[PDB]
Design a protein around this ligand. Structure first.
Ligand SMILES: *[C@@](C)(CO)[C@](*)(O)[C@H](CC(C)C)NC(=O)[C@H](Cc1ccccc1)NC(=O)[C@H](CC(C)C)NC(=O)[C@H](CCc1ccccc1)NC(=O)CN1CCOCC1
Ligand SMILES: *[C@@](C)(CO)[C@](*)(O)[C@H](CC(C)C)NC(=O)[C@H](Cc1ccccc1)NC(=O)[C@H](CC(C)C)NC(=O)[C@H](CCc1ccccc1)NC(=O)CN1CCOCC1
Ligand SMILES: *[C@@](C)(CO)[C@](*)(O)[C@H](CC(C)C)NC(=O)[C@H](Cc1ccccc1)NC(=O)[C@H](CC(C)C)NC(=O)[C@H](CCc1ccccc1)NC(=O)CN1CCOCC1
Ligand SMILES: [Cl-]
Ligand SMILES: [Mg+2]
Ligand SMILES: [Mg+2]
Lengths: 212, 125, 196, 222, 204, 233, 195, 222, 195
């Protein structure tokens, strides 16, 4: 896996790849690694598929129960802490998860929390998670500014996953984009790396290491 | 464990143990709450058949549940301590999990839920 | 394996079962474990099939070269050569061998060579995994200066019981008689020895 | 030390069409280098137009099918004979598998059927309960042999339109039941040739709105 | 720390009507890290072609070794080495290192210049010859290649048709393997002409 | 977690036109020591089922007691215990299969391999296998241990698929079983000469044969074999 | 987690804690605050195993805050340190122990004295003029043995602390991304923003 | 592998299957396991494939030089002795399991050799992973005084038992007959009972399907 | 040892190598030059096991210098890289192998072209437009895939290199104490003093 999310002037960008592996066997190229918890909350998935898939869908059920009981949408902080407290109870049992809880609320504004299976919970502006996280960081960090436009921010997120998809053997397939605003999350399409790589190479003039 | 159902219905559809618990409240010292435009005030009566009292150390009638919520009461004094303790613990538990202090409505809903549970549990009044 | 060698009035007789195993699978049910190193000097092989065969082949070569220079070698001499190979290579060998031979001066003789590579001259000797079940029987029934017929019966009954209790032993009972008269090979099948 | 797991071999394959879906699997059952049975079925009709197969360690496979079949029975009892949809079955199976997260069922599970719009559906699971809907999936011992062939022939991967300078891809289209069965038969004969744990026989279960039909074909017995 | 799967890579070979084809991917990596996308695994000594998968240092070493040996062969014999003879030389050289082997999976391909017969062969790391009428596979996606070849292959394919079959076998096998891909090369070999084509494939 | 102590070797079986045959030797091995010789490893259940067991004997005797108790429990409040509601071979098997899988799931298995042979009430032949792992399978021929490697090949020459079952008589079927037992005595180092055999027919019922011996053995060719390579004497 | 330091001077206690959070070959964050206020005049910094650290710190925070509300009174630094020690002493013989080391800095309002306590994951408590956990101590203790005096001011203590951080930045293998510094005195707890 | 050897009236016959494995994958479907040591001495080999070929070629080379040196036809016992002493020296690390047979001036002979260097004599022998399936047949049908045609039938039947019942063995049966006074006849693919059925579909692609980036003529000439 | 980088541009090859030498919990030196000049137009940087690195580098240096004197001629970068690869390929099957990874940057005077070779301790050689050894590559390769062009100048290459070092200083766990940068071109080898 490679997943990222960063905060900027116009909200939050979230980008992920779509590969699943069992050792060197490429098991799938079309896996959904973003989970739509509600119209204002997103969750990213890295590590074990079952672990991530099961518990993040569980998380959504706990978030729905919050708004039924409290007549109000749950905060990003409280949502992330439910998950982190859950995995802490299982600490040592062997769960494998690297997740990011991203969303907007009135009291918090745009917010991102990193949560992993050894109990770490961190608020932050930029995170990259997964086996190809370092490749994504390299492009994202060197091109990041707070004052990026919505159009440029979407591209940088897309371009950072593409970088990791290319270099990391355990990342690839396609890119899934999301933009989170004050009005909620907006889906910005599935982008196959088969076509996207060559399109980016030609138009941008990058990837000169590859035989054109 | 002591199991007896103490709170039960009567032919006319009343739960006498709950209604007799209201009589204990009627016996208690008066307590009043008034809310203004930008504040709330809690007033409490103290009976004057007790002189030679030490007011420094005597339990106060109004109790802080958290730094932003207070609780007063009327009825059995000993019973009130149990509710106050449970409320204070829940207040700290809420801050721990939700990373935000309780609302007044939430705290009330919790205390009321405890009181209800003691009206249909065996072996308790 | 179950193997033994017994001295008697006229000479010495060697005996053995015919089972070779890989775990619980019988790789050969008609194995010959009694092997010639010289005209009237033979040996019973137990332990690793590869090790015992390689040793016996080297001994036969040594005694053939002995004979070419110094004439017929003694049974003691044959045992010494076996010992030398077993002792000096004790870390790399799994071989339990009994040596038996007939001289005219010394008559019948039996030497046993366990895992360590020590030598022991005895009136009779038993060895192999099946031998453990017949120590009691053989001790109570062995006499010195037995006849040919008596000694054949003693070995037949002994190996019969060893075969009956040991799963690593079975098949036919092979024997080799060593006397002044010459060299005789005997065989005994299950239908006979099982109902003893 | 006692080892609670074993490997019973075999391989399974699921493909989905426009108004149908197939779930195929070989009938051979093995341990180590021995054959246990030349005809031991492992693709089952579970009711409500849902077929299922759990390949790997047979004892865990049977247990899981047995538990899912029973889950369908109680779904009817508790919800007024309502039909269990393929998407609902899939979610239920995740919980069956993840319930034993710390002592897993050692199987690759595949289910097939029709979705609520009448279109063909195939879901596939890992041993601990992850799942995904797909047009195509192979599972088991020969999965690595069959799956890349399916990418090429079902989803037209790496195939471009002739003369278009590798710019236009071969367009996606649904396959007929006749064409799908051809691909299944060829996939298993190829797998039988190159994998020792695959052979003896092939059993295919086809699922349409009319019900569940069966077809059987001989495979090489060496 | 499994020598044969540190760098990654694949090779495949096929026969046709009066022709042979041999193909390989271009990836060289260090486990998960992709390093080079220009690492060709097919070499040739005269008209005899050799592909090698496995540990990359040994791939380079063996190429240099067989260039060495085939150069001396030609000087002494006064002729080019044939595929059948070269196959025996590869086997002898690998078995020489029986208890300290090169971690490789070589594949020979070519046409005998005297008889005109198409020839292919494969080996394990210690030198066992694997001859075939149809196809030979090697590398980290050998399982995938076995499946593609067994279904797609048919006998007596024309050079142009054979190119399509071998290319599709390699591409679809490589896309199901994490350590293989990053480009591909195909060699079509007729009696007295050899065409080399680079394939367009996904770069992840 | 166990290790087996006293053990029993192969159990072999097959189907024929009117029923099923099953056999197993009478030995109880203690490692390499052939300790006990009077051990019955075929256990009948009613007049229509025989259960053959290999592996740990203490666990076998435990299973005997469970089957014995199953008969008793089935008779309770059951007027049709000897008729329509009698214990079927399929009922007996499913019970054992359930137990075997439950025990392996608790990491405390019954260290056995089991074959349930019998005839159903509608005349259908029943033959199915289950072991310590809870693995189950059915086939025209079934065998455990060494029997799986040596007996099955011989028995499959008679009945290779389903359609060969009607074409196989009881005479031909028994002959193939008896031969397979002889072969196991030649080649299995934890087998005995003495064995038991059981036939379950849809017409003639249950026939239980005890104290059978392996006979007509070929050993005479052993006399001609001398040395191990170059020896000529 | 990695670097936590503490210095007690005449009228205050100063805690310095590293900002880095590192997992694998990636620095995930460079602005992490490794501390929790337990009461108005008591502060606890922490370091150790991932997850355990924050879980333990917040659990202690909740318990001390509960006490404050119940009694309408602030526990002394000595009393808080003893409570924390006992919780860690219980933990070490549990099925899964808390792997967390802590420093507690507080100002006792009854005694009008600053106090610094060092407690490790075993429940080993000591009161000290200056303290450190982990590899930090191997540099800072000898340095402070030389330059520390008991009658120093808060400003002198901050300069003394700058000297420690400079040494660690010179000789430590890992980049810990600087420190967050907090002061505890008669007027409570405050953060130094420019360090 | 399955390999066997059987003696008869006026000579000896050996046989073998033709499957070569690489884990659970079939690497070669028609490989030759019968080796020629000398014209009338042949060898069937199981175990590590490279070892059986290398050891048989080395001894075969030395046997030829020995034959030329002595002006005599080579004996089976000479090949036996050279093979066992070589394999013993390497303490089982050379994984060759061989059945050695042939005719010579002394007569007809049949031996087996194991990897650690032990040898056996017999009228009928079997080695390899399918040796138990083969030995079951041999123990059932072998008798004294077999004819040529009877021995070929028995040998191939024993190999077939391995082909059908052992997952390690498969494909075809190879035979070699060695009769006294006659030339040895090598019967490659004596039986072929595993022919691949016709495929359901031709996978011939339209020309231009594969996307190409570069073309170039390669120079093979000087 | 840890970080070594290489970039080939239009007319030159640029090598950047970390200055830190760390043993245990102590940075023993912050000005270490992890490179050796093999010939006037060929430079080799190195990283790996302590002792092995310098011993190997100087051994290669001595052999290339011996060749230069004997033939009165400078070996090409391709020829030098092949010699180095073979020495490492021999080493890997020795009793105790050299655990050293290298980059070779050179300017071929006959071809008038810059050349960069990456060789690991196994003897795995590749020619590349940009290269890295160790954990550095996990950040720098993706970065260079984006920003690198083949027709860049030496100045553009230095700015591209600054971008790599900045990223490593942000996301790497260890403090590697900056880098020494050297340029190889038609005029030979020179060091950039202010980086
Ligand atoms: C990138 C792609 C690499 O990590 C991402 O991190 C993704 C995360 C996304 C998809 C949520 N991770 C994976 O793809 C993940 C990597 C992994 C593997 C194993 C353990 C932890 C992490 N892959 C999986 O989880 C795969 C999913 C596919 C469908 C196979 N699942 C497995 O490998 C399963 C179950 C693993 C498992 C976990 C806990 C207990 C037991 C098992 N294993 C198998 O299917 C077994 N195996 C497959 C190969 O064939 C033989 C049987
Ligand atoms: C009785 C049986 C016991 O005392 C006799 O001593 C006979 C002696 C006769 C044959 C001269 N012994 C055997 O039959 C002997 C038993 C044995 C086994 C292992 C070590 C020592 C003794 N059997 C053998 O030597 C067989 C003969 C082959 C099958 C023709 N060889 C093996 O079983 C080899 C032995 C390898 C070896 C190990 C240790 C020291 C020396 C040699 N083992 C295998 O082939 C391993 N096999 C692999 C598959 O899994 C089962 C084990
Ligand atoms: C039947 C099939 C088994 O009973 C026969 O015995 C045949 C004998 C015939 C072919 C001579 N045996 C095999 O087919 C044999 C099985 C085997 C496997 C492993 C060890 C021993 C026996 N197969 C082989 O020997 C293959 C031959 C290939 C397919 C041409 N070789 C391998 O599988 C090699 C084994 C190499 C080896 C090295 C050191 C000690 C022992 C064996 N293994 C690989 O190629 C696997 N791997 C591929 C990736 O690169 C690294 C090696
Ligand atoms: Cl022997
Ligand atoms: Mg087979
Ligand atoms: Mg990739």
């Amino acid at each position: 896996t490679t997943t990222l999310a960063f905060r900027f002037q116009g909200g939050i960008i979230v980008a992920v790849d779509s590969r699943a592996t069992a050792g060197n066997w490429v098991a799938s190229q079309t896996v959904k690694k973003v989970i739509e918890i509600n119209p204002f909350l997103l969750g990213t998935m890295a590590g074990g598929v079952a672990d991530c898939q099961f518990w993040e869908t569980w998380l959504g059920s706990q978030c729905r129960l919050h708004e039924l009981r409290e007549k109000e949408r749950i905060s990003v902080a409280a949502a992330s802490k439910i998950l982190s407290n859950l995995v802490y109870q299982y600490k040592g049992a062997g769960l494998s998860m690297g997740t990011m809880i991203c969303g907007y609320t009135r009291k918090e504004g745009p917010t991102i929390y990193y949560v992993d299976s050894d109990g770490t919970r961190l608020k932050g502006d930029i995170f990259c998670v997964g086996s190809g996280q370092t490749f994504a960081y390299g492009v994202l960090d060197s091109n990041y500014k707070w004052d990026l436009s919505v159009e440029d921010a979407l591209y940088l997120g897309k371009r950072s996953i593409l970088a990791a998809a290319h270099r990391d053997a355990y990342s690839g397939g396609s890119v899934n984009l999301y933009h989170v605003t004050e009005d909620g999350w907006i889906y910005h399409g599935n982008h196959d790396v088969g076509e996207l790589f060559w399109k980016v190479k030609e138009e941008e003039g990058s990837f000169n290491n590859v035989i054109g | 464990g002591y199991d007896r159902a103490l709170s039960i219905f009567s032919p006319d559809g009343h739960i006498f143990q709950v209604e007799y618990a209201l009589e204990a409240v009627k016996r208690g010292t008066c307590a009043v709450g008034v809310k203004g435009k930008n504040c709330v005030v809690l007033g409490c009566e103290r009976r004057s058949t007790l002189k030679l009292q030490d007011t420094r150390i005597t339990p106060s009638k109004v109790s802080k549940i958290d730094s932003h919520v207070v609780l007063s009461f009327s009825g059995l004094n000993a019973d009130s301590r149990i509710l106050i303790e449970k409320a204070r613990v829940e207040a700290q538990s809420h801050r721990l999990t939700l990373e935000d202090p309780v609302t007044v409505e939430y705290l009330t809903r919790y205390v009321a839920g405890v009181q209800q549970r003691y009206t249909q549990s065996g072996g308790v009044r | 394996t179950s193997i033994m060698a017994v001295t008697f009035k006229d000479g010495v007789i060697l005996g053995a079962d015919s089972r070779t195993t890989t775990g619980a699978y019988i790789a050969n049910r008609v194995t010959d474990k009694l092997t010639r190193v010289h005209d009237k000097i033979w040996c019973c092989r137990s332990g690793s099939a590869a090790d015992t065969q390689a040793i016996a082949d080297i001994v036969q070569y040594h005694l053939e070269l002995y004979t070419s220079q110094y004439g017929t070698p003694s049974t003691e001499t044959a045992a010494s050569v076996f010992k030398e190979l077993c002792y000096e290579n004790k870390d790399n060998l799994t071989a339990g061998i009994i040596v038996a031979g007939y001289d005219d001066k010394n008559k019948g003789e039996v030497y046993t060579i366990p895992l360590g590579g020590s030598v022991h001259k005895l009136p009779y000797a038993i060895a192999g995994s099946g031998s453990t079940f017949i120590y009691g029987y053989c001790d109570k029934n062995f006499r010195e200066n037995m006849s040919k017929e008596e000694t054949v019966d003693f070995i037949k009954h002994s190996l019969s019981q060893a075969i009956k209790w040991d799963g690593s032993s079975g098949g036919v009972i092979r024997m080799v008689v060593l006397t002044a008269a010459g060299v005789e090979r005997l065989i005994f099948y299950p239908d006979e020895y099982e109902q003893l | 030390q006692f080892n609670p797991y074993g490997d019973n071999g075999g391989t399974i394959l699921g493909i989905a069409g426009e108004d149908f879906a197939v779930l195929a699997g070989d009938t051979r059952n093995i341990t180590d280098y021995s054959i246990n049975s030349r005809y031991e079925p492992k693709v089952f009709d579970c009711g409500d137009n849902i077929v299922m197969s759990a390949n790997g360690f047979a004892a865990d496979g049977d247990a899981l099918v047995k538990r899912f079949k029973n889950s369908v029975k109680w779904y009817h009892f508790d919800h007024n004979d309502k039909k269990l949809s393929i998407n609902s079955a899939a979610r239920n199976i995740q919980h069956l598998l993840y319930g034993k997260r710390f002592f897993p069922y050692y199987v690759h599970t595949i289910i097939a059927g029709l979705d609520e719009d009448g279109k063909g559906a195939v879901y596939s699971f890992d041993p601990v309960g992850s799942y995904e809907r797909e047009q195509c999936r192979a599972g088991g011992a020969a999965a690595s042999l069959i799956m890349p062939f399916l990418d090429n022939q079902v989803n037209f991967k790496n195939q471009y339109e002739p003369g278009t300078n590798g710019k236009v891809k071969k367009p996606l289209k649904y396959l007929s039941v006749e064409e799908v069965i051809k691909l299944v038969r060829d996939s298993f004969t190829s797998a039988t040739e190159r994998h020792i744990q695959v052979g003896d026989g092939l059993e295919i279960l086809i699922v349409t709105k009319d019900g569940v039909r069966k077809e059987f074909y001989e495979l090489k017995r060496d | 720390s499994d020598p044969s799967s540190i760098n990654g890579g694949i090779v495949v070979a096929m026969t046709g009507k009066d022709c042979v084809a041999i193909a390989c991917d271009l990836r060289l990596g260090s486990q998960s890290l992709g390093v080079s996308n220009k690492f060709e695994k097919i070499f040739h000594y005269g008209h005899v072609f050799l592909g090698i998968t496995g540990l990359a240092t040994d791939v380079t070493t063996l190429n240099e070794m067989f260039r060495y040996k085939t150069n001396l062969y030609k000087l002494k014999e006064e002729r080019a080495i044939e595929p059948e003879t070269f196959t025996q030389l590869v086997s002898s050289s690998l078995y020489e290192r029986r208890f300290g082997p090169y971690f490789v999976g070589p594949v020979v391909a070519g046409i005998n210049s005297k008889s005109g017969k198409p020839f292919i062969a494969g080996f394990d790391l210690i030198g066992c010859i694997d001859e075939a009428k149809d196809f030979i596979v090697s590398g980290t996606a050998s399982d995938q290649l076995f499946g593609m070849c067994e279904s797609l292959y048919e006998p007596n394919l024309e050079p142009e048709d054979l190119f399509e079959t071998i290319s599709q076998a390699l591409l679809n096998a490589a896309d199901r393997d994490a350590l293989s891909g990053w480009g591909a090369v195909v060699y079509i070999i007729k009696k007295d002409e050899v065409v080399k084509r680079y394939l367009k494939m996904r770069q992840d | 977690t166990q290790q087996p102590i006293v053990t029993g070797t192969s159990v072999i079986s097959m189907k024929y036109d009117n029923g099923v045959i099953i056999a197993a030797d009478n030995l109880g091995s203690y490692g390499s020591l052939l300790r006990f010789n009077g051990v019955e490893r075929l256990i009948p259940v009613g007049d229509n089922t025989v259960v053959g067991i290999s592996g740990d004997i203490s666990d076998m005797q435990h299973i005997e007691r469970l089957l014995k108790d199953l008969v008793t429990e089935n008779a309770y409040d059951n007027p049709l215990a000897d008729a329509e509601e009698a214990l079927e071979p399929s009922y007996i098997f499913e019970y054992l299969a359930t137990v075997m899988y439950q025990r392996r799931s608790k990491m405390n298995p019954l260290w056995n391999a089991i074959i349930v042979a019998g005839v159903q009430s509608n005349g259908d032949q029943f033959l199915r296998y289950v072991n310590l792992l809870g693995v189950t399978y059915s086939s025209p021929t079934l065998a455990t241990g060494f029997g799986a490697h040596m007996a099955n090949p011989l028995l499959r020459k008679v009945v290779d698929r389903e359609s060969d079952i009607p074409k196989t008589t009881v005479q031909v079927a028994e002959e193939a079983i008896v031969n397979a037992m002889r072969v196991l005595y030649y080649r299995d180092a934890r087998s005995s000469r003495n064995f038991s055999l059981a036939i379950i027919d849809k017409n003639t019922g249950l026939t239980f044969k005890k104290n059978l011996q392996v006979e007509n053995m070929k050993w005479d060719f052993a006399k001609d074999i001398k040395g191990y390579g170059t020896q000529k004497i | 987690m990695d670097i936590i330091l503490g210095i007690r001077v005449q009228d205050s206690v100063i805690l310095a804690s590293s900002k880095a959070v590192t997992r694998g070959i990636s620095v995930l964050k460079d602005s992490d605050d490794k501390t929790r206020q337990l009461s108005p005049h008591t502060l606890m910094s922490f370091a150790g195993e991932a997850g355990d650290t924050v879980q333990f710190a917040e659990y202690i925070q909740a318990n001390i805050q509960l006490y404050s509300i119940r009694e309408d009174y602030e526990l002394s630094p000595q009393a808080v340190s003893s409570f924390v020690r006992q919780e860690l002493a219980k933990s070490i013989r549990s099925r899964r122990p808390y792997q967390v080391n802590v420093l507690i800095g507080g100002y006792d309002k009854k005694k009008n004295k600053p106090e610094l306590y060092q407690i490790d994951y075993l429940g080993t408590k000591v009161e000290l003029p200056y303290g450190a956990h982990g590899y930090s101590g191997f540099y800072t203790f000898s340095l402070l043995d030389h330059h520390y005096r008991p009658d120093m001011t808060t400003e002198e203590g901050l300069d003394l602390l700058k000297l420690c951080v400079q040494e660690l930045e010179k000789r430590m293998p890992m980049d810990f991304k600087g420190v967050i510094v907090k002061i505890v005195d008669k007027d409570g707890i405050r953060q130094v923003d420019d360090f | 592998t399955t390999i066997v050897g059987v003696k008869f009236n006026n000579g000896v016959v050996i046989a073998a299957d033709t499957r070569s494995t690489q884990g659970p994958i079939v690497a070669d479907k028609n490989c030759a396991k019968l080796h020629r040591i000398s014209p009338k001495i042949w060898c069937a080999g199981a175990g590590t494939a490279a070892d059986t070929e290398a050891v048989t070629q080395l001894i075969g080379s030395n046997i030829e030089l020995h034959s030329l040196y002595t002006s005599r036809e080579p004996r089976v016992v000479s090949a036996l002795q050279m093979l066992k002493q070589h394999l013993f020296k390497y303490q089982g690390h050379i994984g060759a399991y061989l059945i050695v047979a042939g005719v010579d001036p002394t007569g007809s002979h049949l031996f087996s050799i194991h990897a650690h260097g032990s040898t056996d004599v017999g009228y009928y022998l079997s080695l390899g992973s399918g040796s138990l399936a083969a030995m079951a047949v041999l123990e059932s049908h072998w008798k004294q005084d077999l004819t040529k045609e009877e021995a070929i039938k028995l040998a191939s039947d024993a190999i077939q038992a391995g082909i059908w019942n052992d997952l390690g063995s498969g494909s075809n049966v190879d035979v070699c007959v060695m009769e006294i006074g006659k030339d040895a006849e090598y019967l490659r693919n004596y039986l072929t009972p595993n022919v691949r059925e016709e495929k359901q579909k031709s996978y011939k692609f339209p020309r231009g399907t594969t996307a190409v980036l570069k073309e170039s003529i390669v120079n093979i000439c000087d």
